[PDB]
Design a protein around this ligand. Sequence first.
Ligand SMILES: O=P(O)(O)O[C@@H]1[C@H](O)[C@H](O)[C@@H](OP(=O)(O)O)[C@H](OP(=O)(O)O)[C@H]1O
Length: 1565
Amino acid sequence: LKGGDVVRLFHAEQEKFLTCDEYKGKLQVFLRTTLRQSATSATSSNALWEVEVVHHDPCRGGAGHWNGLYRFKHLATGNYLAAEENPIKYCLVAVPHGNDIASLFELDPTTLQKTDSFVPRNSYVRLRHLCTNTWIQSTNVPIDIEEERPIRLMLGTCPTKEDKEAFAIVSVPVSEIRDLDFANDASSMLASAVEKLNEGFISQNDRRFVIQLLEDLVFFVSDVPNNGQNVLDIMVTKPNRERQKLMREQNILKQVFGILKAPFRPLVRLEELSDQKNAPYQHMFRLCYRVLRHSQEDYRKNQEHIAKQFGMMQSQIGYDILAEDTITALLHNNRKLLEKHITKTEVETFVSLVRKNREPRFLDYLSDLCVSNHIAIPVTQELICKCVLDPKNSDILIRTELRPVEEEVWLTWTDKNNEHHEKSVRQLAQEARAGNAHDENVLSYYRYQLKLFARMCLDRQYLAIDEISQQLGVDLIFLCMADEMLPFDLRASFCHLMLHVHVDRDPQELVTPVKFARLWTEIPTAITIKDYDSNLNASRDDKKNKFANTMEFVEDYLNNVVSEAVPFANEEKNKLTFEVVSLAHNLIYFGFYSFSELLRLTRTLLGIIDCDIVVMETKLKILEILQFILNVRLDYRISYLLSVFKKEFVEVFPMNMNLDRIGEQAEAMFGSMLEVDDEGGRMFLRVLIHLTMHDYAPLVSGALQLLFKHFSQRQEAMHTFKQVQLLISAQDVENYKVIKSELDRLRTMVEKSELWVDSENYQIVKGILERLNKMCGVGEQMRKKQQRLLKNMDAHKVMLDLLQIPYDKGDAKMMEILRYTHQFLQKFCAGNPGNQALLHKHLHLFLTPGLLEAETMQHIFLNNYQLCSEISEPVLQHFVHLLATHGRHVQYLDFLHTVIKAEGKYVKKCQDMIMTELTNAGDDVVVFYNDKASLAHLLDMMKAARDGVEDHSPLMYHISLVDLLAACAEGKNVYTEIKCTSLLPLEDVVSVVTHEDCITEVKMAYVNFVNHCYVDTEVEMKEIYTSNHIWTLFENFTLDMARVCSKREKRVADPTLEKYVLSVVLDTINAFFSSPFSENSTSLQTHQTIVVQLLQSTTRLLECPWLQQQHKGSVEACIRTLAMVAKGRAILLPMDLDAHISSMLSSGASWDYKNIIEKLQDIITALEERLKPLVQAELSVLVDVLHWPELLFLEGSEAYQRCESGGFLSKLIQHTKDLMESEEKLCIKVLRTLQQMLLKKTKYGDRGNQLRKMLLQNYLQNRWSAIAATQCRLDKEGATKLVCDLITSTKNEKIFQESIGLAIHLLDGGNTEIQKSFHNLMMSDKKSERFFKVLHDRMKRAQQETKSTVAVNMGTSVLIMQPILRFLQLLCENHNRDLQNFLRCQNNKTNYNLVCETLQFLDIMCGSTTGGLGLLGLYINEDNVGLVIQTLETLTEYCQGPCHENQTCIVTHESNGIDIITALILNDISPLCKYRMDLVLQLKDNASKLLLALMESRHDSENAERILISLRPQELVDVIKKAYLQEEERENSEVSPREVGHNIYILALQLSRHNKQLQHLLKPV
Ligand SMILES: O=P(O)(O)O[C@@H]1[C@H](O)[C@H](O)[C@@H](OP(=O)(O)O)[C@H](OP(=O)(O)O)[C@H]1O
């Protein structure tokens, strides 16, 4: 560290960054809080700090020493950090000048330092203020409490020193400093311009200088080298988020806003902008607006800062300032901001201005405003509709008509002069071809008006769809789109309108291609494609009656496109083909096209996309179409197999099956006619491979998904069949029919939401919901059957849409309908994890600020440990934020209570997050009555509710809060137990308990609190056993038991009181008396009478006949513990009561539905068994295709060259890297496929081999060494870099595991090229530290978990070790000295010793000191024997070569792993050898190998004596002799005890050179 260098100070405990900012006009220093998930990423320019050194010469900075005074300066404000009297005694603030001792500071090192050596950068230090001799500290008191959710935190000083107040230094790149300085200069120039504007006098040259400033700022913001384009029209491909944030914090946006506002405040006027005098001012406003547009691109914070000014841009609209385009961009960026900004006056202004200009371009602004992210916004849509469809704006809308004149289309428009002109469309198009400017202008205006109508009608806006449909008929639209004279763009507009108005309408409904649940009677005996399509042919024809000719047009147009030599030669036709393909996709998904027609169309589509944003989108849509056709084919296959099953069942049982006969037809089905393409699959697969190469990410993802699915047809169909459901019983058939009808009606009503929202529709929907509630049924098994039926029906999506329906809080009828819907969802999710998964998929909608949907979410999360594991901190945060904002009722707490527990299992992480959030929120969310006055208020409410407690009472809210807190206490969790102890004192608990009259439920809650937070403490609490709160609680408990018994004697008793006692009091008493901590209680001699009375109360409780049998047994166990405690606590029992206690001790010592189902299940199982090998046979074909993609493409093509160069594989690897974060499943699939490619070839049996031969012959034309060649090819293509990047950056366990597996497979065989590539990557790359740190951290976590399980008595952390150790062994295989030395010393800034980590792992696994003592038999079991063997092999690989440094490290490590290594040989491993002796022999052999490798080539004796110290020669000789004799008892196995003994003998011979006794013993008779 040197003076004049800028760095950042970071707090470890607080995980926050110090900063200085002008909160309310005054500069203040604070520890800003960050809501990000990565503290290191919370870096701001204003948080930069500079270090200044104090020297004798004021101009001399030099380099700071550990004993030199230091000062902290702000790189932006320039003020210096200092401490001043706090109105904590001193508070940190910023001063303008450093000419005072206050700014002086010193850095106390946290660790040892090299005397007065220069301070190293990025070293922990503690700030100390020498001016007043006070130590800096951190506090949670905010400085900006005035604002909700404060971020600024106070940093005071303490007279004493605290070791936790350590600040870490972080370096800063020169780029940040340069950007900050340039931004400051630009801000100064902008301030000068603002001063000129405020003065109202500015020279022409000065204004030109301002324009030049704006141009330079435009260049800087664009970040694109200037190419001569206008700054106003500058184009930026991607903005820089850091630069935008720098501008925002510098307030350059504020400067621009002031520059725009001040002239109109005048120096300039909006009307006067037309004047040449104010033309340069208008140009400067335009520059400001373009700069704002570039600044706010893709930045929500900048968008919010602009929204703060939304008023001024709204006023600026209607003037030549590009406000329209800027506002449209900003509004399209975010939908919520659009909902805030949009207003009816703004819509009217847009209509008025577009009318004023009579230009097409205005309409585009409204068109873009209508939709965002291509997703419609109902409010803006309706607002635009209301203004557009009004007759007043009929002038702007060009009316069109069809007249015979066989038919012709005419257009009438109105000019600004009000003159009306009407012309034929065909004549207008011909005049356009001629080139008339007016005709072109009217055509463009017409096109933009149709585009605006289409965007208005987007997402089924029936409020305005009707009028537009009436104005433009289907026949008119088809005539227009069929007309050839019309330009391609206008035809495309007509096609888009046709798609978005008529085709997408109520009569049409999205059809799910695959139906899981079918009826047995429905199944046809004989099935063909025609029979399959006959199921809904009548409905298809009925719907076709309206749009029949359009399908003919689309089919013919696609035939023409495929016939065309070059598909995408012309862009004007590219637009039209995009529109036509989109229309085809919508028609297909609406189901107009039959299965045979879809198969016919697949050929044309694949030809079109078989050998530009529009082209890429067209290809993507065609891929989606193909996916739909393939899934329809899957459904057809399922139906055919079901038909075969029906035929066989009918034959056998008219009222022994030929399973082989069924299986033959099943195999034949998979295989002909079903094939999408004529070639037989080659066309499709080639299309997919070619698409994978293209740049577009969604296109590549879809191509890869289709390619993977194409080679897994059989397994998917088998899964679908196993999930098929059959209806055979009349009751369930009737239920299915009723559900279908009700769902159809409900879907229609939801679709016409717009019409029936505000009627009879309300009552109809309420009746439908009641019928559904009755339909859901009762009975657990009946419930699961009905849930399966409902999931098959797919009504969940309909109900989710019903919830999505918009509404106003005033509609109580719609509230009741929502309650019915929530009950329906509850019944769907009632004890069904499968259904709950579907709900979690769409949970994003469920996250709303409402009690009823919160309860529904609770019921969704009920009993799902998978969902608890995958829970999200942001979701929990938003829940606690809901509590903080409102905290109205207990349902919020009940949700958290449900989340806490799952399957009677504890998740420590969620509990910790809940406790932390509760503490951070503080008294606002947590309300406690600890204070006497608050307890008095609680007493008042308790007395009011003494007769009864209301279901929404604040008393019950407090009780629920207490229960929630105790639930977090469950689990003997020390970390949260400390917080609970801080939260609530036993003295408050005793006060409230000892109150004369208390609520029974409150008492249960507090006893539960005691049971969890205090009794179940992991760490002994001294206050518990040094305090009398527990004895006061026990006397109260005994009084309560006496009350319960007297009540039952009186025949009048309170179930709440009885439940309180039985449940909480008994458990607390038993836990206390069985507590190991309480075994040393020394006040029991004083409370002898109290404890004896408690035991008497328990005796009476057991004597009571009313006590339940389960309660009786639990009480008997508790009383056994009570007596065991009572033996020696200075308590003498009465004679009769002692006899009764002895009796207690004695007691403690004392057509066929089911036939059809079974037949189907047996057939499914037989088919699965038969087709098991063919699945792998098909899968292997994908590996062969990936190995040889070029054979697919005709030789001599450009694709052939690219494939031969390995381009396809490299693109696959790079795309895997790019998509690891977005499509984790596809990333994992690609990684596993790469592993399969690397793996050795394996035979698949006779049938599998035949299938593979046929598949390869059809797909391809015909055109350890192999493993090494494949490994080298993958390394060249970039597999090594992909693996390194994944291992460094992935946060997914599956991704990490697959990456490590790919590494192991690549390195298999000790490939020197792969090892050298890994070494080069690690050494050259800057992420070597990240890679090694990830591996070392995983190893350390596994070691910690291993210690935990050893203490307890096998964990993903341990299981992940095997691949990591294998990877390290393979890296060091073949005695690679470079790698072996690198692992020990990476020579990086932080060096992690993987060798010592492995040795420590072995030590902890074997038991460390106890293992050395010789408890290896107990410590090692069958499960971990493989891991121990792998660790020993890895250590041997490290040692061999020989690596002298590694050998010395292992022998001299402080863990004494050598002791365990030798103990392994000597110890018998008795528990294991009895059952699995071969593993013990292998362990001993590996240990001997490691010991020999340790002294491979060490001439010195140091290692020999170190080994001999633990390994006495006599034991070694006895082991060798024992092994030789045990040879005879050998059983069949690869390991040989004679070989093990020979290796041990060789080790003994090597050791004997330094030991005379060993030599003498080894000498034979
Ligand atoms: O990823 P998102 O949705 O944008 O949210 C980010 C983050 O969650 C915070 O809102 C904010 O950090 P602070 O809380 O530290 O302000 C940050 O802005 P920033 O770049 O101004 O920090 C955001 O970008």
